[PDB]
Amino acid sequence: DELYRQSLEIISRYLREQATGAKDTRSGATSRKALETLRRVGDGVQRNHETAFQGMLRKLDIKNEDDVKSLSRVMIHVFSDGVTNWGRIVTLISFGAFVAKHLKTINQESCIEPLAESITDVLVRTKRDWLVKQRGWDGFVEFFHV
Numbered sequence: 001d002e003l004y005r006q007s008l009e010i011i012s013r014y015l016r017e018q019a020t021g022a023k024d025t026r027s028g029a030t031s032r033k034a035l036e037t038l039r040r041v042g043d044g045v046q047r048n049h050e051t052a053f054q055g056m057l058r059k060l061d062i063k064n065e066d067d068v069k070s071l072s073r074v075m076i077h078v079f080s081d082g083v084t085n086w087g088r089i090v091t092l093i094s095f096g097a098f099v100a101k102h103l104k105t106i107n108q109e110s111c112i113e114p115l116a117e118s119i120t121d122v123l124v125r126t127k128r129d130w131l132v133k134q135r136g137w138d139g140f141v142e143f144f145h146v
C-alpha cells in the first residue's frame with residue numbers, strides 16, 4: 001500500500017539516521033518534507049522525554065533479535081488506548097529512534113529494520129483511518145511547523 005510504503009520509508013530513514021549514519025536517498029517530496037519535520041521535532045522529543053524513554057527501554061529488556069519481534073505487542077496495547085493526536089505519533093517514532101540507538105549499543109544493528117517495520121505496523125494498523133482524515137504525512141508537516 002502507498003500509505004504503508006510512505007510511512008515505512010519515513011520511519012526507517014529516521015531510525016537509520018539516528019542509530020547509524022544517513023543518508024542514501026529515492027521517494028517523493030512529501031516523504032522528504034516529513035523526514036525533515038521528524039528530524040527537527042524528534043531531536044527535541046528524545047531530549048524532553050529522555051527519562052521516560054530510558055525507563056520504558058529498561059522495561060522492554062532488549063538484548064537479542066527475539067526481543068524486538070515481541071516489542072510490537074507492548075506498543076499496540078499502549079498506542080491503541082486513549083486519544084489520537086500528532087504529539088503521540090511523533091513520540092512513538094522518537095521512542096523508536098531511541099530504541100534504534102540502544103540496538104546499535106547492544107551490537108544488534110540488523111534489528112533496526114524489523115523495529116522500523118514494527119513501529120510502522122503499530123502506527124498504520126491502529127491509526128490508518130485517522131491518518132487518511134488528516135491528509136497523512138502532509139498534515140504531519142503542517143501540524144509541526146512551529
Ligand SMILES: O=C(O)c1cc(SCCc2ccccc2)ccc1NS(=O)(=O)c1ccc2ccccc2c1
Pocket residue numbers: 049052056057059060074075078079087088089091092095
Ligand atoms: O505515545 C505513546 O503512546 C507511546 C507509546 C510507545 S510504545 C512503548 C510502550 C511501553 C510502555 C511501557 C513500558 C515499555 C514500553 C512509545 C512511546 C510513546 N510515548 S508517550 O506519548 O510518552 C506515552 C503515552 C502513553 C503511555 C502510557 C503508558 C506508558 C507509557 C506511555 C507513553
